[PDB]
């Protein structure tokens, strides 16, 4: 579990969005596994606006932050799960690292701010949904 809190927005994995998130919806994209809801209070996370490929992510299944190298956001085939059929997930970045069901929502960060959140796992790889292209999170 986990979310990004920026301005008047809450960014979560779409597959883990609560009833309250859908009742206060701003934007959602199944192909990226992202959902953004509105908040009453202002958030303080800063979204990275960069092309970094090295960062640190939080892994709840190990209670540890790990430094990683990760790929550029791409359309990657993801195996069928209880949440989606087998499909290409867009804007996804992979790194060599531990992930397991329960780790989605963990933040990946670089020197510039938040890069994205854990969204996939398997075969000793961890996948992060990028948020650096959502420039609108920094406004209105
Ligand atoms: C099966 C699950 C996963 O990748 N997904 C389930 C949830 C929906 C995902 C998607 N975005 O499409 C695919 C997974 C397997 N490992 C080892 N770690 C995970 C994870 F970290 F929980 F994501
Ligand atoms: Zn960066």
Give the number of other Cβ atoms within 10 Å of residue 17's Cβ: 18
Q: Is 112 annotated as a binding residue?
A: yes
Q: Could you give the CA distance from residue 115 to residue 2 in angstroms, rounded to a whole number?
A: 14
Query: Which contacts of 49-53 are long-range, i.e. CB under 8 A and separated by 24 or more positions?
Result: 49/112, 49/113, 49/132, 49/135, 49/138, 50/110, 50/112, 50/132, 52/110, 52/111, 52/112, 52/115
Q: Label the pairing between strands 54-59 and 64-69.
A: antiparallel
- From 81, 89, 116, the mutation candidate for ligand 1 (largest count of ligand atoms within 8 A of CB) is 81
One domain, residues 9 and 75: no
State whether the beta carbon of 84 lies less than 6 angstroms from ligand 1. Answer: yes
- Asked if residue 114 lies in contact with residue 8, where contact means CB atoms within 8 angstroms, the answer is no
Structural domain total, the chain? 2
Residues 62 and 104 in one domain: yes
Q: Are residues 19 and 53 in the same domain?
A: no
105 neighbors 116 (Cβ within 8 angstroms):
no
If asked whether residues 50 and 36 sit together in one domain, one would say no
Q: Do 67 and 129 belong to one domain?
A: yes
Residue of 15, 29, 45, 98 with catalytic role = 15
The experimental technique behind this entry is X-ray
């Amino acid at each position: 579990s986990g979310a990004i809190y920026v301005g008047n927005y809450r960014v979560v994995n779409r597959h883990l969005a609560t009833h309250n998130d859908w009742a206060n919806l701003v934007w959602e994209d199944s192909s990226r596994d992202l959902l953004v809801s509105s908040t009453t209070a202002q958030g303080c996370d800063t979204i990275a606006r960069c092309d970094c490929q090295t960062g640190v992510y939080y892994c709840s299944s190990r209670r540890k932050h790990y430094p990683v190298s990760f790929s550029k956001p791409s359309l990657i085939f993801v195996e069928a799960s209880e949440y989606y059929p087998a499909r290409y997930q867009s804007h996804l970045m992979l790194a060599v690292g531990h992930s397991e069901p329960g780790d989605c929502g963990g933040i990946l960060r670089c020197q510039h701010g938040v890069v994205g959140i854990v969204s996939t796992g398997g075969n000793g790889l961890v996948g992060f949904a990028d948020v650096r292209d959502l420039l609108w999170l920094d406004e209105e």
